[PDB]
Every structure is written in C-alpha cells, then in structure tokens.
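User: For a benchmark we're assembling, each entry needs the component sequences followed by a predicted structure for the full assembly. Here are entry 17's components. Please fill in the structure.
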Amino acid sequence: KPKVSLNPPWNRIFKGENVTLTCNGNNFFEVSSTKWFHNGSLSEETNSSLNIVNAKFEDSGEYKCQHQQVNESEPVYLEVFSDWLLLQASAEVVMEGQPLFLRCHGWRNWDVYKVIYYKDGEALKYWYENHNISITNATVEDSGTYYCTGKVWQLDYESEPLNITVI
Amino acid sequence: DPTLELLHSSCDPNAFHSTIQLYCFIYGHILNDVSVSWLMDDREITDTLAQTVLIKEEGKLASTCSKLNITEQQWMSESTFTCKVTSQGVDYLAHTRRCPDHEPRGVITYLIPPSPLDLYQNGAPKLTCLVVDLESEKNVNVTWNQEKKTSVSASQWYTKHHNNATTSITSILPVVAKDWIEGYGYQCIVDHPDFPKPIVRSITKTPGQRSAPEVYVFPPPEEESEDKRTLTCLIQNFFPEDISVQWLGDGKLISNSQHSTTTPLKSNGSNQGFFIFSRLEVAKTLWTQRKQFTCQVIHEALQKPRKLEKTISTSL
Amino acid sequence: DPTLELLHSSCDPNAFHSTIQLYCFIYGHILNDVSVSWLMDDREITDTLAQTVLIKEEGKLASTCSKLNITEQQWMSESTFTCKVTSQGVDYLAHTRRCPDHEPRGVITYLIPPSPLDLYQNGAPKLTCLVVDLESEKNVNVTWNQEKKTSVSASQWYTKHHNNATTSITSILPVVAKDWIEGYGYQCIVDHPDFPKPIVRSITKTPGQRSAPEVYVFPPPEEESEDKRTLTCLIQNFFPEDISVQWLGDGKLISNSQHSTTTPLKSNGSNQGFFIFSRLEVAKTLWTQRKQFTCQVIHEALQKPRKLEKTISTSLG
Ligand SMILES: *[C@@H]1O[C@H](CO)[C@@H](O[C@@H]2O[C@H](CO)[C@@H](O[C@@H]3O[C@H](CO[C@H]4O[C@H](CO)[C@@H](O)[C@H](O)[C@@H]4O)[C@@H](O)[C@H](O[C@H]4O[C@H](CO)[C@@H](O)[C@H](O)[C@@H]4O)[C@@H]3O)[C@H](O)[C@H]2NC(C)=O)[C@H](O)[C@H]1NC(C)=O
Ligand SMILES: *[C@@H]1O[C@H](CO)[C@@H](O[C@@H]2O[C@H](CO)[C@@H](O[C@@H]3O[C@H](CO[C@H]4O[C@H](CO)[C@@H](O)[C@H](O)[C@@H]4O)[C@@H](O)[C@H](O[C@H]4O[C@H](CO)[C@@H](O)[C@H](O)[C@@H]4O)[C@@H]3O)[C@H](O)[C@H]2NC(C)=O)[C@H](O)[C@H]1NC(C)=O
Ligand SMILES: *[C@@H]1O[C@H](CO)[C@@H](O[C@@H]2O[C@H](CO)[C@@H](O[C@@H]3O[C@H](CO)[C@@H](O)[C@H](O)[C@@H]3O)[C@H](O)[C@H]2NC(C)=O)[C@H](O)[C@H]1NC(C)=O
Ligand SMILES: *[C@@H]1O[C@H](CO)[C@@H](O)[C@H](O)[C@H]1NC(C)=O
Ligand SMILES: *[C@@H]1O[C@H](CO)[C@@H](O)[C@H](O)[C@H]1NC(C)=O
Ligand SMILES: *[C@@H]1O[C@H](CO)[C@@H](O)[C@H](O)[C@H]1NC(C)=O
Ligand SMILES: *[C@@H]1O[C@H](CO)[C@@H](O)[C@H](O)[C@H]1NC(C)=O
Ligand SMILES: *[C@@H]1O[C@H](CO)[C@@H](O)[C@H](O)[C@H]1NC(C)=O
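Assistant: Structure for entry 17:
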C-alpha cells in the first residue's frame, strides 16, 4: 500500500495553512490515476499531489489515497487546532531509535520566547530563543505528555498537552 | 510652540552615574509663564529631584532645561516619562522612553469588581472590563456572558486612545446588588479580527466565611509640633478584603486625597482577617475647632445597613 | 575649558519617524578654532549631513551644536558613537551608546540594597546581586567593583536551580556602614558568553534629605476581655525608605511571627517622608506578664545610636 506523506513534517497544521499530500509508492507510475478519499468520500483531486490552501476545521479528519487496483492506504489523521501554542511533533507514534522533533509553534508563525518544555509535569528544557527538541535516539522514557509554556508578545501562555508515546 | 525635546543623556556604563538625567529642552514658551511637571506613566513625580535651570534668553524665547534624575530601573522599565509644560492655560505633554527592545506587549484584559461603597450604600454596583495594549480599534468587540441568571444589560464599549501609541477599550456593566450578594459570576470576552481565541475572563465572588470587622479609632499621640494630628483607624478581622473606608468630619465626607488607606494584608491570626490602618492627616486648625471625626466602614459581613461608624471627639 | 554634552534624540512611538538626532553641544570653546568629529566604533563618519550651527556667542567664548542623523538600524547595531572636540591641542572624546540595552538572553538582574537593620546595630552589612533566568552557568562571571573605595573585601557567589530549568546566581559582598553613609557605591557587573557587552548595575545611597522619623505607640483599644490584645506602633516622616521596626518586650526581642508591618505608602502633603504602621497581636496571657512593651525603630538619620524606643506600660487605665 502507498504512503501518505505531508510536506510539513507535522500533522498538526494551523487554521489557514497550506498542506501538500503525496501518495508515495514505488513501481506505481500513472500519476493521472490517483483517487483521494476524505472520510470515505471521493474528492475532486485526480493527481498524486493534493494541495490544501487556507485549511478550515472541516478539512480535519482522515485522508486516504488509492492508486490503481492496490489496496487503500492508511487513513492519515490531520487535525486543525486554534490556540496560542500548539507544539507539534513529527508523529504521534515514533518507533524506537527514530529521530523525534518537537517544536513549540505559535499562531501565524509568531516568534516565541521564554520557551519552557514540561514532560508529564516535570520541566525538561528552558530557552530564551525558540529551539527544537531533537531526540536522535528515541527511548522508552521519552513516553508521556509534553507541553510548552512560552512568552509571546510579552504574554505568557501554556500550550495543549501532547501524547508523545513510543513503541 | 513649546517644542519639547525630551532627550535621555548617555547612560554612562563606565562611570558611576546610575541615574539618567532626562533633559526636557523647552523652547517657544513665554517668560515667567511656564510651569514644568514630570509624570511617570500617568503618575505625577513628586520627589524634588527637578533641576530646572534657565539656559539662555533671546527675548521671549527662553531655553529651559528641566533635568529629571531617573533610576536605571525606572528608565529601563519601558515607562512613559512625560514632560508637561503649562503655559497660558494650555498643557503640552511630551512622552519619552527607550527605543523598543523585546517584542511589543500584547492585548491584556483587566477585570474590576464593584466597590463595596457602590454595592452596599448607593446600591449601584458596576463591573469593569478594560482591555489595554490594543493595536487597532477595528472589528474589536466585547461580549458579556451573564452565565447564571438572565437580564438585559446593554452597555458601552468606549475606546480611548493613549499617547504611547496604544489604545484601550472599557466596558462597564451596572449589575444588581442582590445577584452579587448571593453570588453570580459573569464573564467578559474581547474579540479581535485576527486573534487565536477571544480573551475571556470570569468574575465570581470570593468564597469563605464572612467575619464582622473590628474597628478602633486611636486618638492623636501627644502634641507633635502642633501641625499634624494623623488620626488612625484600625480595621481588623474581616473577610473578604473588599471593604470601604471613609472619614466624615462633622457629618461631611472627607476626600480620599487627605486620608490614606493601607493595602490589605493577611493577618497572622487564625481569623484570616485583614488589618488596615487608615491614616487621616489633619492640621492644628481642623482639630482645634471641636470637630468630631467618624471612621465609617462598609463591609458585607456587617448587619444592616452594612455600615459601622466610630466617632471620636476632641473634648475627651 | 569647553563643556561637552552628547545626546541622542528619543524614538517617537506615535509619530512615524525613523531617524535619531545626535546632538553634540560644545560650550565655551575658542572662536574660529573649532573641530567636531563623529566616530562610529573608532571610525570617521562618511555621511556629510552634519548640520553645525553656532548656538550663541559669549565674547571670548562660543557655544555650538552639531546635528547628525542616524538610521535606527545603524543605531541598534550597538555602535559606540563618539563626539570628539579638539580644544587647545587636546582631543576630548565622549562615547554615548544607546543605553547598554537591557536584560539580554533573559537573565534578570536585581541589586538588593542592604537591610536597614544590620548597619547601625550588629555587625553584618552586605550587598547582594541576583541574576535569574540563565540558560547555563558556564563561563558566566559576576564582579563587585567597589566604586571610589576599592577596599580588600571579597565577594562570594552561589548558584541555585529551580523547577523551570533556570539557574539563579546570587553574589554577596560585605560592605561598611561608614562607606555606605559616606556616599560610596558599588557596581555589580555580569558577563555571559552570549552577549559580549557585560551588564552593569550600580548601587548607591538613596538620594534625598534624610529626616528623623517620629514614632508613637498607641494603647490597646479593646474594651474589656478581648482575648487577642493589639499594639500599634506608627512611624511617620522618615526618609529615605531604609528603616526597620522591632519590639523588645521584656528583654528578648519579640519574634516576627507575632508581628506585622504594613507596606510603606507616600504621605500626602506635609513632608517628603513615608508612614508605616506595625501591629503586634498577642493572646491575653502575656499582657498580665510582659511589662516592658517597647517598640524600637532603627533609621540612618535618627541620632548617633540610630535607635528610637517608645515604651508602653500595662499598668495604666
Ligand atoms: C500606555 O499608557 C496607558 C495609560 O497609562 C497604560 O495603561 C495602563 O496600564 C496600567 C498597567 O497595566 C494599568 O494599571 C492597572 O490597573 C488595574 C487596577 O487599577 C485600577 O484600580 C485601582 C484600584 O484597584 C486604582 O487605583 C487604579 O487607578 C485603577 O482604577 C490592574 O489591572 C493593575 O493592577 C494590578 O497589577 C499591578 C502590577 O502592574 C499590581 O501592583 C496590582 O496589585 C494589581 O495586581 C494595574 O494597576 C492602567 O489602568 C492602564 N491605564 C489605562 C488608562 O488604561 C498602558 O499600559 C501604556 N502602554 C505601554 C505599552 O506602556
Ligand atoms: C523560574 O522560577 C524562578 C524561581 O521561582 C523565578 O525566579 C523568581 O523571579 C521572580 C520574578 O523576577 C523574583 O521575584 C522578584 O524578586 C525581587 C525581590 O525578591 C527578593 O527580595 C524580597 C525582599 O525584598 C524577598 O522577600 C524575596 O524572597 C527575594 O529575596 C524583586 O526584583 C521583585 O520584587 C520587586 O518588583 C516587583 C515587580 O516586578 C514589585 O511588585 C515588588 O514590590 C518589588 O519592587 C520580585 O519579587 C523571585 O525572587 C525569583 N525567585 C528566586 C528564588 O530567585 C524565575 O523568574 C522563573 N523563570 C521564568 C522564566 O519564569
Ligand atoms: C471527517 O471526520 C472528522 C473526524 O474527526 C471530522 O472532524 C471533526 O470536525 C468537526 C466539525 O468541524 C470538529 O468540531 C469542531 O471542533 C472545534 C472544537 O473546538 C470547533 O472548531 C467547532 O466548535 C466544532 O465543534 C471536530 O473537532 C473534528 N474532529 C477532530 C478530531 O478534529 C470532520 O469534520 C469530518 N469531515 C466531514 C467533511 O464531515
Ligand atoms: C497558500 O498558497 C496560496 C496560493 O495558492 C498563497 O497565496 C498563500 O500565501 C499560501 N499560504 C501559506 C500559509 O503559505
Ligand atoms: C525546527 O525544525 C524545523 C523543521 O526542520 C525547522 O524549520 C526549524 O527552523 C527548526 N527550528 C530551529 C529553532 O532550528
Ligand atoms: C493523552 O493526553 C491527554 C491530554 O490531552 C491525557 O489526559 C491522557 O492521559 C494522555 N494519555 C493517554 C490517552 O494515554
Ligand atoms: C464582533 O466582532 C466579530 C469579529 O470581527 C464579528 O464577526 C462580529 O460580527 C462582531 N459582532 C457585532 C458587531 O455585534
Ligand atoms: C569572564 O567571562 C567572560 C565572558 O566573556 C570570559 O571571556 C572571561 O574569560 C571570564 N573571566 C574569567 C576570569 O573567568
């Protein structure tokens, strides 16, 4: 089955951003034959690349892509949030040893200062300039809940807790 | 015109000159017709650190240098240091601060609950919702969620533009006293055209047992230079901190400028009350005319009509 | 002996202006023999928009202002702008800088003055400088430059961690009460690898005319059998803010647990001093035992002992 790949490495896009979905697969060809399913309903997209501009809440849900007569791909879940900080990860589930990227993202790509990362209620890192939590070798202890507190426009706000679990 | 050049001198890290000397170069005013004042974020600067000296005169053009000594903390607090010139009954204000560092401050909401004076004496409580540090007053509106109970309370959303490149929006809701006495919190929501979520703030009466305040008035101590008496009214063991303190002179209310009320503090006693020492400064003439002074306390824990008066005379 | 005053114009937040006006005023220089040089990091300026006009003439003296326009981007580059004037063959230079910016990369600095109780009493005067919101403590150093005094005392700095992954460094330096009352000051200088320019905070005595506080103790107002007797000690017309209040009921000083002091508020009118109230509440078991009940106030302008004691006796009424 083909794999649905997102141009942004995070499946937690904002409200109004552009996202590109590619139905990657080897030995497939025939770009003109690619069906797209949104909640089980066929869409108007025909090519293997689907572009979403100014995404709304209705665009959230499961996306599926099918090519030729092969079985349907995984229904990748894309969810849209609307808050001050919606810290994003590469994937909800990450295999052990795979790199993991965590970044505290604010509204309209606004710069975030005084970023403090808390894991299951315990602080992990503190920075004055926004940075990335890059775990090259994911461990079992990394499982839990991550949330960032950041000072944006001289106002301190707390993000939505996450469910970062590894296998 | 009095072109005010409010220049901040070099902060001199190398030298021991911590205090910055703000120079308010005043030109275009009239001789012996100019008054200079200093304001720190809409607050008058009362310390006598001003060194207003006449530089030169070219006729009616008198170059005035008003030197304000500001501590490093005040200057670096991103204040709104204002040089105010009064001439011919006209006031001109020049505002200065450091050139911006860090990010600009975002819109911040403040909620003012009704004062006990308007809640238990005048019976006209009002809830205030004030959003400040707002950028543009376009497509911004305030919605009030009544939550418990329903009533028609259409109000104003009036906007005032400040002199520090910021504007504020204030909405006042006249509420009924009975709902607040029983306890009915409301919500204020402010909405901007491009915001993540509208800012919502909730108001609710503070829970806890109410204790009747104890009020005591102390007579002036001895004859202190026969110039000030400094009457003291101590109020202790009351909860919550929402309380109204007033001074009455021979049945006439005394303005809040004359008497100062200390901020409530958590007493170390088990009653969980607050102790406040209202100090009223009265000269010899006021006290020697057989004037009786009454300390009046308004609180919700008191019985009807939520007023306690303690009167002290001068013949005792 | 000309007087040099180099100033930078204020950035207007309301008006849409993007040029900073540098003014170099030279007073009492030599007529027909003048020279003004604008240096940016010890380099001569290239722009020719240097409006120089004679302010005034004092016969053998003259006052002249040099005006320059600086872009905000150039000014924010931490360029050490300097005005140089050649008088009698001597080059006098004045470097401005914006205002050594502010707390960089976090790191909030608090320079706490000594408590107004260990100066004129027991011997333990110290000045403390605390830096918080530090990413790391590596290669970060704090100096305690003693201005105009130097002395030989050495400072001690210790680190502390918190629950927000922040490191706070507190440095304490012993001082001398005589040095503090003579007007000497100190300079806490913090240097961190991130920002090359160290942050300096200078502390001196609070300016103003010192005044002797007036202290009065009021008798308890509780009528008959109230269990928690209350004593009030009021201090008025004290300047500066440095003052301490305690009690010495029957020898040993009363613990701060059974005592409180209100926050200082500025007194309206009268003088420039403040007013404070201290409340001491004790159960009705020590009132029949304690007899001294003396409120003591320590201020730096009271007298040679720097102590004012007011005693109230329970054998009254
Ligand atoms: C541009 O200039 C404007 C105008 O000056 C500034 O707006 C002011 O901002 C300040 C600071 O936020 C506001 O002050 C705040 O007011 C509230 C309470 O004040 C009212 O109530 C008290 C009695 O309770 C009255 O004495 C007072 O006069 C007011 O009626 C509170 O939200 C704040 O107090 C809380 O925070 C402070 C810390 O700052 C604590 O010490 C307090 O205990 C408390 O927790 C605060 O006092 C002020 O009201 C604003 N003025 C107006 C007209 O709106 C802008 O901030 C300024 N912009 C910039 C960028 O500098
Ligand atoms: C990570 O967590 C740490 C630990 O909590 C935080 O560090 C605290 O930061 C706060 C805010 O800066 C500090 O509070 C400030 O301390 C100073 C005075 O406090 C000392 O002195 C008083 C007596 O004078 C003691 O009671 C007290 O214990 C301290 O020894 C002052 O700078 C501040 O008060 C002054 O300013 C405020 C306005 O800001 C006024 O209202 C006050 O009246 C007064 O003028 C303030 O109290 C606090 O001390 C720090 N704690 C420690 C243990 O160092 C970090 O800030 C936090 N980091 C982040 C990014 O959140
Ligand atoms: C396809 O199915 C998905 C299943 O998740 C649907 O996503 C859901 O869409 C609804 C309607 O937009 C969302 O509800 C909204 O959520 C927030 C709450 O703050 C707010 O925008 C609205 O008040 C509303 O309640 C819901 O959250 C969302 N679910 C998830 C998990 O994101 C999607 O709508 C379906 N698509 C179609 C075309 O039916
Ligand atoms: C999305 O693409 C459109 C053009 O199709 C562009 O105008 C818009 O800025 C893009 N949005 C983002 C968030 O990049
Ligand atoms: C975090 O990673 C993303 C994705 O590669 C990148 O765009 C961003 O710049 C990184 N952030 C930092 C602070 O390096
Ligand atoms: C996932 O995160 C939620 C909060 O978003 C938390 O309540 C929950 O315990 C987490 N773990 C799960 C569902 O296993
Ligand atoms: C309040 O403002 C919002 C956001 O601009 C707007 O959609 C709404 O219609 C406004 N409500 C009014 C004007 O009653
Ligand atoms: C003090 O810190 C600075 C930071 O730039 C460093 O260059 C210097 O070597 C340090 N001095 C000592 C004595 O460690």
